[PDB]
Amino acid sequence: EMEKEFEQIDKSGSWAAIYQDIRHEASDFPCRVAKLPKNKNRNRYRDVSPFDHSRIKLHQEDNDYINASLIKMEEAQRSYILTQGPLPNTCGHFWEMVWEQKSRGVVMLNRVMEKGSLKCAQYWPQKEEKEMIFEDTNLKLTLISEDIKSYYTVRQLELENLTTQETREILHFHYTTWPDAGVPESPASFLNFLFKVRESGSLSPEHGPVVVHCSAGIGRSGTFCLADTCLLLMDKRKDPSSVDIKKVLLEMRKFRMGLIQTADQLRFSYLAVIEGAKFIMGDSSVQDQWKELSHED
Numbered sequence: 001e002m003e004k005e006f007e008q009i010d011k012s013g014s015w016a017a018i019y020q021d022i023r024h025e026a027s028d029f030p031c032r033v034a035k036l037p038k039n040k041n042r043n044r045y046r047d048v049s050p051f052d053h054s055r056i057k058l059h060q061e062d063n064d065y066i067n068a069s070l071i072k073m074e075e076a077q078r079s080y081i082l083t084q085g086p087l088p089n090t091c092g093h094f095w096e097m098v099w100e101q102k103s104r105g106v107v108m109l110n111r112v113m114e115k116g117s118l119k120c121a122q123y124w125p126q127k128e129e130k131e132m133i134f135e136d137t138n139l140k141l142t143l144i145s146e147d148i149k150s151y152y153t154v155r156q157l158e159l160e161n162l163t164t165q166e167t168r169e170i171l172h173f174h175y176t177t178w179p180d181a182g183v184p185e186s187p188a189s190f191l192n193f194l195f196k197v198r199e200s201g202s203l204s205p206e207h208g209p210v211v212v213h214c215s216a217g218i219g220r221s222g223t224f225c226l227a228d229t230c231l232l233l234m235d236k237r238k239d240p241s242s243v244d245i246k247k248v249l250l251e252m253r254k255f256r257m258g259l260i261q262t263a264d265q266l267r268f269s270y271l272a273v274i275e276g277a278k279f280i281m282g283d284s285s286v287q288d289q290w291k292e293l294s295h296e297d
């Protein structure tokens with residue numbers, strides 16, 4: 001029972017030692033492509049790279065590299081693409097990946113400006129009447145509508161392949177009050193946001209993997225994916241005790257380094273999963289309580 005593991009960890013004040021245990025047990029795979037000199041300007045952080053075995057390949061011939069990893073959780077039956085905040089020169093790469101991987105949703109967990117600095121490019125149009133065209137990858141992107149809440153915003157985007165003129169609708173879920181190296185305000189407001197992503201169809205198996213990013217694509221992105229997979233696994237049987245959150249994290253770091261970046265984020269994940277167990281185990285009323293507790297209006 002992760003409730004007992006949680007209480008035992010809290011009581012001994014062992015969150016930092018436990019978190020360092022995961023870091024030292026974590027997979028270590030080569031990132032040879034990411035480090036090729038020609039890819040220097042494609043990485044936002046020197047110390048954050050996708051493993052070669054799980055990196056997302058662009059379907060282009062010039063250079064197929066992007067800082068993005070496929071997290072394939074076989075037992076949970078869910079896939080995610082975790083990526084960094086697009087750079088001014090990789091916004092076309094980012095949308096090409098979205099197109100080629102057939103994703104329906106993009107979860108953005110950071111602000112463009114955080115802590116006084118630019119953590120991500122403005123890679124989607126802020127105004128309906130000012131579409132964006134990415135000429136390197138021949139893609140058109142239009143803001144179709146926005147639904148602005150108090151701590152997150154949902155956008156409907158139209159992505160057009162300017163070569164084939166096929167169009168796709170993309171849902172953008174922008175969490176705007178989750179600080180870098182930090183935790184959400186509350187389990188309830190994190191879960192409320194997670195379930196709004198789930199309710200959108202963006203995580204259906206009829207779609208390509210949802211794209212999840214923050215600035216580096218590891219810390220907040222890791223927290224979001226870990227909690228989601230844990231709740232899905234618990235959903236599959238109806239057996240909370242079946243879910244080893246630390247083993248799930250380690251399995252995830254087989255596909256991308258550094259997932260979950262502080263010990264308080266690991267502790268938050270437990271709380272989110274424990275609270276989320278109420279809904280998975282039969283209490284649907286808890287969804288509306290999260291929404292109310294979130295003050296999203």
Ligand code: VO4
Binds near residue numbers: 110215216217221261
């Ligand atoms: O932009 V993150 O530091 O939460 O990987």
